[PDB]
RNA sequence: GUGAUUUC
RNA sequence: UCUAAGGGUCGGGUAGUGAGGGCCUUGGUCAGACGUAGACGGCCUUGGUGUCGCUUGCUACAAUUAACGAUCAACUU
RNA sequence: GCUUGUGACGGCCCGUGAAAAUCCACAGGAAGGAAUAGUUUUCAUGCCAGGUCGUACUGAUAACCGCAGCAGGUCUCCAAG
RNA sequence: AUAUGGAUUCUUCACGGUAACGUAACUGAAUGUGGAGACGUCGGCGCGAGCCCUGGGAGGAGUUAUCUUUUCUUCUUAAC
């Protein structure tokens, strides 16, 4: 299990050839004693790694998941 | 590893040989002290250790010289020959090519008498007191065996006696 | 007040056979068998543990890299620098006398 | 006042007099224990080096 | 007062120690960036193979190469020689400025290659294209 | 006596003590004589008398250790190696000790 | 000041072995656990790590020396003989 | 062969 | 039931000039995709929580009373 | 605080307290290797594979030995207030 | 077994740092050498882990003749 922290190489990964299934983990936290805020884990199946992305912003979250590849299968929670 | 000299050759025979000393190690069983010495070996290009009787005053990283040619100092070897009248010297060969018999103990030498014309032969008086004549061409290590003064303290135990006693051959507890 | 057992077959306080008590995501505490520490290595000429080595068991050398286990230097992964440099000063001294020392003979013999 | 003032200074160089003699108890004591080593055999020359 | 320009000493410490440079400039006094007394100095990295009789051209044109490098050195990391080496030919590139460029530093190691290689190939200084043994 | 010579040098002149500094002054080209304990070690020795040669400098060999030197300099700790960088009214830099 | 008015490093073995034995023992124990000068670096970092062998905490050289001090008076005496007459036979 | 050590 | 004793961590200043970091109360320009709403965010302050202040450069008793205060905790005599 | 591991030290020895497999590094340099083209699998990623035998249960006043289903003996680990 | 990316190379086999040394890499046969494997016992001192003790809060259970913001219990985190 390794976190990946570039959107280009978790891009980069998620289309790499060896990649076939991606899994989208939904949290519910709290930021600095505030709001309970989302936080969306996407994490790729690789070979050898499970490679983890976090993004603790949901418009964001969501645009990837849109610029997701068609092929790679998603599994949501 | 057994305490004996280099092995004679043309080397020790006629010039010398240079080694140095690596570590001064305590061998079980044995009073004195042992002396790792490195050689290069004449022949072929490789390190040759040995296993000296380590005198009064060797200490690591010592340059010791083996040969007729050698300096007259503490820790060379030197053939009988090549030693003035009076020295003191330890490890004593017998004769040549047994790589040392006399004065091995701690705390014992040998003393030179004196030489020979009519062949090359020296006289030596032993750690006993007897005077003895071996060939001059036999070798020996200037000084005197390291570790002297150790028969001095009273063992005052049974149980330091035991285990002293349980390295060596002796049988102890005695019987009979 | 949870206790323990030994998860390997060795029942004995051997010195290949330590554990330490971890508490796992099941709630439980559990004996986990922990391999012996590893040893720095040393130098060559002073047996001082040599800087900038990794120190690991001597099989796992086998996998890391190659910086893991050298520095950028001459005798790099075996002596410690302080050694290295006598040894360049002895080595240079050494070619120093030969030159000085073959002159002198020369001339010695020369005039004798 | 004044007569406490002499006290106070007589005590003072009475004290720096006591230092001195403790210095003194010490080099002397000093000395003995290297007559002991030297008697002891605990001394070691430097001809070897 | 013998370390100065054209002098040959030998690298004690670092990552060329054992190497032989020459100094090319002396700074005594030393400097902001380097607050000691040092010495911009051009030395050789990899030193020629020794060739013999047998080898053919090909051979020996391959074996005398050298690589050299530029460095600036604390005086305490050199062993100072009693040989020289003449150090006009990359004087001038061999500067204070040069060494806070990663370019000049490979333009001006450049001069000092090739100013190295004419002169074993002349066969000039071949102690200080031997390599030191230690 | 060289004992007496050199204290009158500590109480009058210029010196150094230490194989840092007394190499320093090497470099530099500042010293006159260097007095070198019995002790030091011999590649310590060999690598002071290239630097003294190098620097046309004289070389002298102390009799005694680095406890005796430092003691004879006039100093509570050990002294390895003393160089004199100003003698001006001591004259040992030309008497043969 | 002095906890043990005579027997000095001979407390630990209290009353046994005989008052002679115990004096015996206990200058050559006096020596051998004793801190010695080095003639290497000059400094009082020598111990014994067994009997003969001499180590200097400092500068890390290991010597050869006596059971239970760092030199014996027959060494010394051998040194400086083997000194005058190597003297004598340069002279 | 005697069995610590000291003293008488 | 009391009395006394035995500790830890943080605390230096305003008299004084002027800039720097962050949700900058209110007020100002550029300016963000989705499901009447629209945050966050890429830029700035002499202000604010004689012009308080969290920061360095410094003159001014820096403490020879920090010889004291705020805060935290154990069981021993 | 208890159990345990570990670090830097100190003490003791007329006692100074295994070997080998195995893995790494250094010195050296037989050589090989590029220009409209080479090298480097001690960097990352990707591909394939891992045989044989033991594995249940007790481990003792009911599982072993004393002719027993004997008030006996038999190595060791964890250890709450 | 092998390929792609990276690195490297027209100064062929990397640059940086005064230095200790750093890093994603950064060729290597004979031959020589070094390290690890690899090591007694005791004492106190420091540190870590599990356990022990304990405060707040969020739950569940017990007691309540009288009293107790109460007694018990859950609140965890593996190799890598
Ligand atoms: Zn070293
Ligand atoms: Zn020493």
């Not at chain 1, 190489?9 to 899994?23: N, P, S």
């Not at chain 4, 003699?21 to 010490?26: I, L, Y």
């Amino acid at each position: 299990a390794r976190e990946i922290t570039d959107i280009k190489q978790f891009l980069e990964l998620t289309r790499r050839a060896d990649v076939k299934t991606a899994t989208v983990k939904i949290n519910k936290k709290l930021n600095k004693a505030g709001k309970p805020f989302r936080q969306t884990k996407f994490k790729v199946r690789g070979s050898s790694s499970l490679y983890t992305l976090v993004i603790n912003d949901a418009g964001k979250a969501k645009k990837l998941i849109q610029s997701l590849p068609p092929t790679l299968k998603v599994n949501r929670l | 590893g057994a305490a004996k000299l280099r092995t004679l050759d043309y080397a020790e025979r006629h010039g010398y040989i240079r080694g140095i000393v690596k570590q001064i190690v305590h061998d079980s069983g044995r009073g004195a002290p042992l002396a790792k010495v490195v050689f290069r070996d004449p022949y072929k290009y490789r390190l040759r250790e040995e296993i000296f009787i380590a005198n009064e005053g060797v200490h690591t990283g010592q340059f010791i010289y083996a040969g007729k040619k050698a300096s007259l100092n503490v820790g060379n070897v030197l053939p009988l020959g090549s030693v003035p009248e009076g020295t003191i010297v330890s490890n004593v060969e017998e004769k040549p090519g047994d790589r040392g018999a006399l004065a091995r103990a701690s705390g014992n030498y040998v003393i030179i008498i004196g030489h020979n014309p009519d062949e090359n032969k020296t006289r030596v008086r032993l750690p006993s007191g007897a005077k003895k004549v071996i060939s001059s061409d036999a070798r020996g290590v200037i000084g005197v065996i390291a570790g002297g003064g150790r028969v001095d303290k009273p063992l005052l135990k049974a149980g330091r006696a035991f285990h002293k006693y349980r390295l060596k051959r002796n049988s102890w507890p005695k019987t009979r | 007040a949870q206790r323990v057992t030994f998860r390997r077959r060795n029942p004995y306080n051997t010195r290949s056979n330590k554990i330490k008590v971890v508490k796992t995501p099941g709630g439980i505490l559990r004996a986990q068998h922990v391999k012996k520490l590893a040893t720095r290595p040393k130098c060559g000429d002073c047996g001082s543990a040599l800087q900038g080595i990794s120190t690991l068991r001597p099989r796992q050398y086998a996998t890391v890299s190659k910086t893991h286990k050298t520095v950028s230097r001459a005798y790099g992964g075996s002596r410690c620098a302080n050694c290295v440099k006598e040894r360049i000063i002895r080595a240079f001294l050494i070619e120093e006398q030969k030159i000085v020392k073959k002159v002198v003979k020369e001339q010695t013999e020369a005039a004798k | 006042e004044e007569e406490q003032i002499e006290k106070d200074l007589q005590g003072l160089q009475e004290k720096q007099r006591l230092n001195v003699k403790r210095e003194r108890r010490r080099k002397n004591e000093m000395k003995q224990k290297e007559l002991q080593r030297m008697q002891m055999n605990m001394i070691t020359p430097t001809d070897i080096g | 007062k013998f370390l100065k320009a054209g002098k040959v000493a030998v690298v004690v410490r670092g990552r060329y120690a054992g190497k032989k440079v020459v100094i090319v400039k002396p700074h005594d006094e030393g400097s902001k960036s380097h607050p000691f007394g040092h010495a911009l100095v051009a030395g050789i990295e990899r030193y020629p193979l020794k060739v013999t009789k047998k080898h053919g051209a090909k051979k020996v044109a391959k074996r005398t190469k050298i690589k050299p490098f530029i460095k600036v050195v604390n005086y305490n990391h050199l062993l100072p020689t009693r040989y020289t080496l003449d150090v006009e030919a990359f004087k001038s590139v061999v500067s204070t400025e040069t060494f806070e460029q990663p370019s000049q530093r490979e333009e001006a190691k450049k001069v000092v290659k090739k100013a190295f290689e004419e002169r074993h190939q002349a066969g000039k200084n071949q102690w200080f294209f031997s390599k030191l043994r230690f | 006596s060289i004992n007496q010579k050199l204290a009158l040098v500590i109480k009058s002149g210029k010196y150094t003590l230490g194989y840092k500094s007394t190499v320093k002054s090497l470099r530099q080209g500042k010293s006159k004589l260097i007095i070198i304990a019995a002790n030091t070690p011999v590649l310590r020795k060999s690598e002071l008398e290239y630097y003294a040669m190098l620097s046309k400098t004289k070389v002298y060999y102390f009799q005694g250790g680095n406890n005796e030197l430092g003691t004879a300099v006039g100093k509570l700790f050990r002294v390895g190696v003393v160089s004199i960088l100003e003698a001006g009214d001591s004259d040992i830099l030309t008497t043969l000790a | 000041a002095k906890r043990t008015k005579k027997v000095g490093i001979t407390g630990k073995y209290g009353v046994r072995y005989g008052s002679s034995l115990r004096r015996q023992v206990k200058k050559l124990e006096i020596q051998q656990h004793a801190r010695y000068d080095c003639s290497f670096c000059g400094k009082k970092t020598v111990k014994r790590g067994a009997a003969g062998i001499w180590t200097c905490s400092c500068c890390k050289k290991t010597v050869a020396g006596g059971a239970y001090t760092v030199s014996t008076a027959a060494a010394a005496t051998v040194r400086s003989t083997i000194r005058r007459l190597r003297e004598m036979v340069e002279a």
